[PDB]
Symmetry: C2
């Protein structure tokens, strides 16, 4: 009506858009500025997309202040295990995480505020859309924590050489 | 800037993003507010999605002032013929249209400013994302012109009852 929001912990929210099927296919509103603002999810200022073969893992990524990003993750085709880990030193849940299956069949989305490291595994070949808030892409602010922080369900992982080099949490430049 | 912009006339712009493929699949930046602002495409306030079976036509839609909408159309899966018709009564190209194929291979986008009627036919089963500017969804301001103006490639058209009723250019409430 047209969105159910569910707090999953730590400021992360599962968003569940309403899907309207008819003879043509279906339609949904994915995000709207007023409704999201009512939930204190600010406006999207950039959107990216990836296509990822089954077993791919991307992450775990974040940009540091002053270019911190919020993210709404959505999966129009396929299915992922999506993850957000608290990477804020002084948080009482620093290092805790939430996993959320996002897929084409649920159309659910994950909102991940600034201060979290994001990644996922592709459980099937998947298109992921990333609606990004706060700040745009800025290379010298990119950081990451190692994929190995998480025990991914598909063992036949496909990870870039770059992400394979991400540091452990204890050695990463994280949030205050 | 990782976009190329081709003017198709009347204010319509085809946008061609840079895609980065690798062993995982691919990645692209789809929209970036500071880059789009430079081409005078304002920021997104709502994003929708549809799935449309082969042969579907949706359109030709707009919202009237003062709930007018700009739209960037993108096709992450499939293939559409996208159409924008100038419905500004005082414009020198009143009633002229552009047609552009937008698809999952090219990853092209069409920027359709306020004052145009938008529609497409799905050439195969297709997911369309609509990035909407200026104003959110407003039912009392929704208007349309007949899809029957367009010689669609697939004769086996699948079309909603509502879109069947869309009026002629002469009888419709259009833009000044």
């Amino acid at each position: 009506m047209p969105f159910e929001f569910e707090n999953l912990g730590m400021g992360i929210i599962l968003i569940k858009p309403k899907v309207f099927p008819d003879k043509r296919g279906f339609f949904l509103e994915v995000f709207k500025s007023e409704d999201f603002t009512k939930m204190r999810i600010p406006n999207v200022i950039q959107t990216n997309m990836s296509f990822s073969r089954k077993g791919v893992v991307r992450g775990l990524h974040y940009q540091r202040t002053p270019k911190e990003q919020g993210k709404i993750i959505f999966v129009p085709k396929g299915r992922i295990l999506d993850v957000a880990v608290d990477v804020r030193k002084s948080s009482p849940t620093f290092g805790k995480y939430v996993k959320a299956e996002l897929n084409e069949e649920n159309h659910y989305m994950l909102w991940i505020p600034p201060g979290f490291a994001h990644g996922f595994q592709a459980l099937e070949d998947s298109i992921v859309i990333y609606f990004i808030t706060h700040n745009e892409y800025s290379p010298p602010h990119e950081r990451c924590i190692s994929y190995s922080y998480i025990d991914w369900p598909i063992k036949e992982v496909i990870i870039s050489d770059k992400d394979l080099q991400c540091p452990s949490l204890e050695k990463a430049e994280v949030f205050d």
